[PDB]
Every structure is written in C-alpha cells, then in structure tokens.
Design a protein around this ligand. Structure first.
Ligand SMILES: CCCCNC(=O)[C@@H]1C[C@H]1[C@]12COC[C@H]1CSC(N)=N2
Length: 393
C-alpha cells in the first residue's frame, strides 16, 4: 500500500540545524506568549528565558500571564559547557503546530545563564522530552510530556524527523526554511521509507538503548560490546555530534582514517575543531566509509542495524573565508559519559519515541542527505547472542 501521511497539522513544524538544534514554536501563559523551543530528548526540564539576554529577542514575562503560578523554588543547573539558574512555576502551554490541546505544565523561568543561549540559534528555551528520573531539581518535577499525556487523550508517543540541509544555512535561512517534523501522539508514514525497526528502551531516564556491534564499511570494529555502551548509550536531539566513549572513539577514528586514507586530513579535523573544504561540488563522499550501529531488537537473539553516510557525520559549515567551497566539520567526537546518538545521526532517520511500548523505532528518513550511489539504511534481522551482556552496570 501507498504510505498516507495522517498528521498534516504537525508535519514541517521544526526549524534549525544540527549545530544549533531543532526547535518548535510553543506558547506559554494567558494571553499566549510565543517562544521558539529546542527539542531536547537528552534532558527532562521545560526551561525558558524569562529575563533580557543579549542573545534573546524575546522571553517569558510571568507578570503578563494571568495563569502563572509561582512554585516558590529556585533551580541551579550546571552543565559541562554552560549553566543557568531560574525559578520554578506552572502555566498553560500549547504547541500551535501540535495537538489542539492546552495543558498546565512545569516551567523553569531562566533568570541568569552563562554559555547556554547561543548567538543566532533562534530558540529561547528548551523542551526536555526525557523522563522524570533526570529532571532537576528532582524527579518530583513532572516533565512536559508526562503532563501532556496525563491531562489529554494524546497517545504516549512522539516521533522526530530532523532534516539536515547538507549545506550551510545562516540565521535568516534557518528562519525561512523548514527543518523537519515533531509528530506528537503518532507516526506519520510520509516521513520515512522502508520498515520501522524497534530497539528496547533499556531504562526510562535518558532514552537509553543498547548497541551490540559497530561496523565501518562492513568491517567489524571488534570491541567487547560493553565498550559501546560504557557507561550508557542514549538518543539525544540536544547534542550535535555522534559522541563515542574514548576507547571506541579512538578505534573508530583509526578505522575511518584507514578507509579514507587516499586523502590525508590534519589532526584538527579528526578532533572536530577544524573545517575541511573542497572546491564546489567535489566533496569526495565515496572515499569516506558508511558507519553501521547494530541495536538490540525486540525479539530474543535478534538485532538490526542503522547505517549512516558521511553526508550525516560530516557537518556542513560556512568557510572561515569567502569562497564557493563546500566545507565541513567531522561530527564524531569523544565522550566520557557514554555514546550519544546526536542530531547528525538522527538526521539520517525517522525516530519514533514509543514511550507506551518502551521502545525506539528507526526508519530511513525521507529527508536524509545522500548521493546517487549510497543511501542511509535500516536493515534486519541479524542473529545476535548475549545482547543483554552489552549493557553496562
Ligand atoms: C543540538 C543542540 C546543541 C545545543 N544543545 C543544548 O544547548 C542543549 C540544551 C542543553 C542540554 C540540557 O541539559 C544538558 C545540555 C547539554 S546535552 C542536552 N541534550 N541538553
């Protein structure tokens, strides 16, 4: 049967890019205040700018909302690279290009921040879509999606199609361009090709999954599979890169260098710091390998694989000079906090966060960037033993 798209109201409701994030329009308060909000599957707080900042064009004004409720509690949120503090409260929240519902949700009103708001990102707050376990200050602060499901008939599922352009966009071009879809409460069949394959959510905190095998151009990286999930593996729309645990990063980079060895790249490129450029149109995609991550399947002793191209893991960037060159950064980098399947990975795939069934679905995205010779893939099944042993305790 031909694929029908059943959620037209929500298709094309995202804007942005992998480097700065993908965001959805939301409203907060009465009367509604419109804000652009980062879609973040790697955290669990709804947190919005609530005071002037050089990089905010607008912010939540609690004093103008008749429905604002003060929870009389502060929150201090330090990250590795950035921090903010704010004040907890609740208010009525809607998503204009979303389900036609309004819910009362927790909001962290951000009053001070450092290196959080990004100059030119276009978003004024973040929607943490992960579970209560990792909410701040503690798990009693109900996340947005939990509130939405509890207060409405919206099914306990959302799905994300993040659409990378495959070339740079400036702030203006991001504003004018569609960057993908967040389908709240369903799966839109127009957004993917081939089959959806599902991996279990190992535990409801992050969206944690288990990787059971890694290949570079079909060659097994051949590490003990626990290494791939040390100390966890998560799916995170709020991280740019594919991040890999240090030892896995070292082994993968060695293999990717060997596969691409017909051209020598400087250390700064492999470290994700320095851009590389080619004359317009001549990017040598074919010298770079595909990367396959095998995920635990839902059936005992079965796995499936997702395969990405260099069109996913090479992130388009503007030249530091003035040129018509096509330039990129290497968007795989090291982690000391486990594997992070970030935006550049998610751009390959339609990703179904099936909370109801405690599983994450992957299918090839209808908007993934590719060439005439190769496409991203989602394929299975494979016979794979002892997959639970790949999980780190
Ligand atoms: C692709 C977007 C790039 C910029 N990302 C952010 O600003 C993320 C909103 C933060 C946080 C909020 O908790 C930690 C912090 C870093 S990792 C994460 N998933 N979320």
């Amino acid at each position: 049967p031909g694929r029908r798209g059943s959620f037209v109201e929500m298709v094309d409701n995202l804007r942005g890019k992998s480097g700065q994030g993908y965001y959805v329009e939301m409203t907060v308060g009465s009367p509604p205040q419109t804000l652009n909000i980062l879609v973040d599957t790697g955290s669990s707080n709804f947190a919005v700018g609530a005071a002037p900042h050089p990089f905010l064009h607008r912010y939540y004004q609690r004093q103008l909302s008749s429905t604002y409720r003060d929870l009389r509690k502060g929150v201090y949120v330090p990250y590795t690279q950035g921090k903010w503090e704010g004040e907890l409260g609740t208010d009525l929240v809607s998503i204009p290009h979303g389900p036609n519902v309004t819910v009362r949700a927790n909001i962290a009103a951000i009053t001070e921040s450092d290196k959080f708001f990004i100059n030119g990102s276009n978003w004024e707050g973040i929607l943490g879509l992960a579970y209560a376990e990792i909410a701040r200050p503690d798990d009693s602060l109900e996340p947005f999606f939990d509130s939405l499901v509890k207060q409405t008939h919206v099914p306990n599922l959302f799905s994300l199609q993040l659409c990378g352009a495959g070339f740079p966009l400036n702030q203006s071009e991001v504003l004018a361009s569609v960057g993908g879809s967040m389908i709240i409460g369903g799966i839109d069949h127009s957004l993917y090709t081939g089959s959806l394959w599902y991996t279990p959510i190992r535990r409801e905190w992050y969206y944690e999954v288990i990787i059971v095998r890694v290949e570079i151009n079909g060659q097994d990286l051949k590490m003990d599979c626990k290494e791939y999930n040390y100390d966890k593996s998560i799916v995170d729309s709020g991280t740019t890169n594919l991040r890999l645990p240090k030892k896995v990063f070292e082994a993968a980079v060695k293999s990717i260098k060997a596969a691409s060895s017909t051209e020598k790249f400087p250390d700064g490129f492999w470290l994700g710091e320095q851009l590389v450029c080619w004359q317009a149109g001549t990017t040598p995609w074919n010298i770079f390998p595909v990367i396959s991550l095998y995920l635990m399947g839902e059936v005992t002793n079965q796995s499936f694989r997702i395969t990405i191209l260099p069109q996913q893991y090479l992130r388009p960037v503007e030249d530091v000079a003035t040129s018509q060159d096509d330039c990129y950064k290497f968007a795989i980098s090291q982690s000391s906090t486990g594997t992070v399947m970030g935006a550049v990975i998610m751009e390959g795939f339609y990703v179904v966060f099936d909370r109801a069934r405690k599983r994450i679905g992957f299918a090839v995205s209808a908007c993934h960037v590719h060439d005439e010779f190769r496409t991203a893939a989602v394929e299975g099944p494979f016979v794979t033993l002892d997959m639970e042993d790949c999980g780190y305790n």
